[PDB]
Symmetry: D2
Subunit: 363 residues, 4 copies
């Protein structure tokens, strides 16, 4: 019942200013923070040896794409290794990102760990010595951080323990970040894995986010100095029932409207396995949803921004331009999408039913 200010007015202004810059209109985040084990899968996917030089080259390829990406990229998330690597011109990657108008971000979690007594559920580690790490990252150019928690929809999951624990560790992580001038991106990802339908994902997402914000409140988190990186509400990857992009958008916006306080500066959606086009089309539908949305609704895409670029590269240095071109194409597409100005081919166009009305009461 008694307040003991976690932050001063000056610290709040710094965090709010950073958070707003990242999600300024038309801007999104390039998530290029794949850890050693994750990026390995990615290079292996294109028959490329996972060496530090190849990881440096690939990251350089994305970070140095032409200026067309500047107004599309408000922030770039990097993995520790990359934060300390340099481009061919000797410039540290953080300097390269900043020179292009982007805020530098650093992934700080240390992966998921199994929760004993659960059906394969996990929590995330990485709090040990996090304050010192954050202070150093800040000095080295990073202004925001990212931490990923993973929840799964199954017969008995997400369980009460998994929801409670993941929400709690996210709050601890957020608290430590803000004490060091770092904007924490809270990522409580609910995997798309499974044959559950849209309504189920919406229900679980609503319960998970309500838990997340109650935890953030209990831990005295300054919401204006944070961003949310949630899963869009979609049917399971193996769901038999099919849905439209408008339905996905309505379910997503409704879930967020019912759980995310207006104070949260922005929502940066993870692509979670969606193809580059799917992720852009859904983000566009989300921004065109006819409901009031008090926060920026943009992207924090990893795969959905790199899929084609990685393939066009194939590990060959001579495919630099071609690979960068593919990344640019997706950055442009999503910049438009986070503004609801994206058009892939032609959409529905004709064929206007009689009984298919737009009723949000069905969600």
């Amino acid at each position: 019942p008694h307040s003991h200010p976690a932050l001063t007015p000056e610290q709040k202004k710094e965090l709010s200013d950073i958070a707003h810059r990242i999600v300024a209109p038309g801007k999104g985040i390039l998530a290029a923070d794949e850890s050693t084990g994750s990026i390995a899968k990615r290079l292996q996917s294109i028959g490329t040896e996972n060496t530090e030089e190849n990881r440096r080259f690939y990251r350089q390829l994305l970070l140095t794409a032409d200026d067309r990406v500047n107004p599309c990229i408000g922030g770039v998330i990097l993995f520790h290794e990359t934060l300390y690597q340099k481009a061919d011109d000797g410039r540290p990657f953080p300097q390269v990102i900043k020179s292009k108008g982007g805020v530098v971000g650093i992934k700080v979690d240390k992966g998921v760990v199994p929760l004993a007594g659960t059906n394969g559920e996990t929590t995330t580690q990485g709090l040990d010595g996090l304050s010192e790490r954050c202070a150093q990252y800040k000095k080295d150019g990073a202004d925001f951080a990212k931490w990923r928690c993973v929840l799964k929809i199954g017969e008995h999951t997400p369980s009460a323990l998994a929801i409670m624990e993941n929400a709690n560790v996210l709050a601890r992580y957020a608290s430590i970040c803000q004490q060091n001038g770092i904007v924490p991106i809270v990522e409580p990802e609910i995997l798309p894995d499974g044959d559950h339908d849209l309504k189920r994902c919406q229900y679980v997402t609503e319960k998970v986010l309500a838990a997340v914000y109650k935890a953030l409140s209990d831990h005295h988190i300054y919401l204006e100095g944070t961003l949310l990186k949630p899963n869009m509400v979609t049917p399971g990857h193996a769901c038999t029932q099919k849905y439209s992009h408008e339905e996905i958008a309505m379910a997503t916006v409704t879930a967020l409207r019912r759980t995310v306080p207006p104070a949260v500066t922005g929502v940066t959606f993870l692509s979670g396995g969606q193809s580059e086009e799917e992720a852009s089309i859904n983000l566009n539908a989300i921004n065109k949803c006819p409901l009031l949305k008090p926060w920026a609704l943009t992207f924090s895409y990893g795969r959905a921004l790199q899929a084609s670029a990685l393939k066009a590269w194939g590990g060959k240095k001579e495919n630099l331009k071609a690979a960068q071109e593919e990344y640019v194409k997706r950055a442009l597409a999503n910049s438009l999408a986070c503004q609801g100005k994206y058009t892939p081919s032609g959409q529905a166009g004709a064929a206007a039913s009689e009984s298919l009305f737009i009723s949000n009461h069905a969600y």
Copy 2:
């Protein structure tokens, strides 16, 4: 992790439509639901005998005010007794209210009770047989309900128990209401008593509302089909430090933006002891606050709409017209205030802009 829909799409639509009608642009709520004990004090204030006829005459006075109040009153909260009384023309009060465009509300709590082991804290009772009562009230013309919980700011209050328990009982009350087609107004009032400052009230209001919405989530409450009746964020009655209406507005809106999901259809402030003019000026400032406000910000005033009316009447039928004129003036003032168009200059629109020197980072 499994959804068992508490409401059908049709039930949701009905609740949402009701909630929106109550807080439609320019409309607020007349809170005339004073229980037998509370109204006694009011009649006591004007040396009027507390008889059922005087209560009926007084309520009639407010309810039958001229058509000028129609676009100002989206809803009227009544006490059980009044819901079943009739105007002089034989028309049931609910019919009178509806004929003037207002939605009929019924207060359903049964008062506060002490929480053992706390420093004078309470919870509220009234859940027993509540579903049957709601079904009956709905049938008899009521479309929304009200339940008041009371919390106090003191040395060790509000305590964790008080916050948890009051939030839980409000959730139960909201759940039962929605099962019967009744829109529940959630009223977690934090009293202004004490010498605490603005920051303290804002802190407590934020913690209380965070608890309220987590509880509503745990009990599967349909937010779109609810309204919130919170205290404005103000310094304590005995606070030595003085504040401007702009600061009170900023503190209030900030607290709400950090805790109230945008899905909540509307916020109807209680006047909590503020004078009629003070309650109107503050409501106006709240609506002029530059921050983004995703819900209607209006009124649910009792004292702030009746103060002068009650005095002008003094229990004399001869002063009926003068008494109604006082009520109408306040209804008109608050109608403008909930639109940010209140000026003492009669009834204007969009007051004179000034500056943006101060910042909200100090909140």
Copy 3:
């Protein structure tokens, strides 16, 4: 973090003394508090008309059994109606109970109500005006009370909400009782309905009881001034796998040892549908279980003490003696059982080996 004594040392002593008297060595509780609707189903199983006189007569039959039950009965739970009824000699039933060395108890809950958004789950009502009711019951001879919450084991139950809500309302009920010199018997019954096995029931019981005691702690309940009336840990009524009495006893005592603080004065098991003989044999095995049991482990039987009595009576006055004889038999058996000195007798009738399992009204 600050204490505000809910009770004085004097109040604690009174409650503690009462709780200990009820479960004194060799003593148990006769649960004859069946409400109007439940007792009606009992009189129907014997073709007897459900009238006030028949209920009075049946209750008199049990309460006026010979002195052999005196050492067996530490307390008797009554329903409101019975608390104010008199024996043929004009003595109020409370006086009858006291004269035989028994403590008088009163059921105060008002039945279960559905929890919206759950799969047929419930919570219990009855807190409204409970303080005044307790004050009056105390003056009229009652020293303890009982309140029943009902949980069910299923694919999605008991849900987090059901556990949390039922635990909270039990805590509220317990708090009010202790403020009025009444020892509250907390009854969080987990139904035996279903085909789940022993370990499933043990798991659920452990989770429920942990929730119950955390809530009692949050509400500042004086445990020494309380009693627990839980279900024994048994497999579902439709479970295929069979277990011995020793296994049931082990699962029951282990669950209790892992959740019930030593301060709790006693555990009075509900029979929950078990036959009179089964309930006695299991209680005996429980008391013979090797593990350390820091609390009295006795009975609070309804059906398991009345099965044979109701049948013998058959609604005929001339069968008074015969019916009372059957009750005395079960009281003696269970008195020995709660001491671990019971060894089923030669004849006990097929009525004592008959399953007293009955489903609920809803499902």
Copy 4:
């Protein structure tokens, strides 16, 4: 509502067996796990350079005390460094401990960290990579671990956040340990700092322990395979009101009885600043307390077992024998104390008739 066994019967047996061995009748724990920063303070108090050699020699001094300590020491907690050091004869310290009949324990927390937004409160870190560390420690001789959380009694402390967070991290630590065959000792220490009285400490201890056990339950902790290391219930260091050892014992035992499930294998009190004699006398009074205690009540002393030994050593190898003698005397004293047979000067008789004139209802 569904169980996914965190442990197999074999795993449970191992943990339970280890826990029971550590607190076997007459046995306690030598806490010699002071981290580098803490042991530094100890050595400087006797003007000794904080070098690894001096630390190794000091720990050797304690671990190689004569066989008289064997029946007194059920377990020895070590700091990482010491677990891998060897005695002068080449034997690894863990081997030294085991040869004397003691179980080897390893402290695994990584110190306290500040909780932002609180009045100087902390949580504890150390979960990162804890599973791998436990697996390594197990392989290297350790069978139990220790983790210290610190709470403080003050104006607004311990806060709801501090209690909840520390309880949760303790549960995570406990879960990880049990997955690796390591018995976790849960240490939620409430500092004695302040002028609060005995009842205040008892209240806070009761609330903290209730929180700890609810968390252990939520995290599926096997209580039989754990030990509790709590502060005894005493007045603050600066409290002007004086209490007898019997009062301290009554408050301590009452607090534990109201919160610690019988399943918990043992309670090993920290000495927390008490002098060697005070700690022994209090532990003795605790074991003589007339109330029923379903768990072993012994010691896990650091300072209370080393004070005189550290001083007698003074960093001089020539004082080896003199120093060891002081430690041996305290080991013998506390072994008698945990049996309730300790009398500071000359023994007389272990006669235990009844207790003094102290009504437990006053607690």
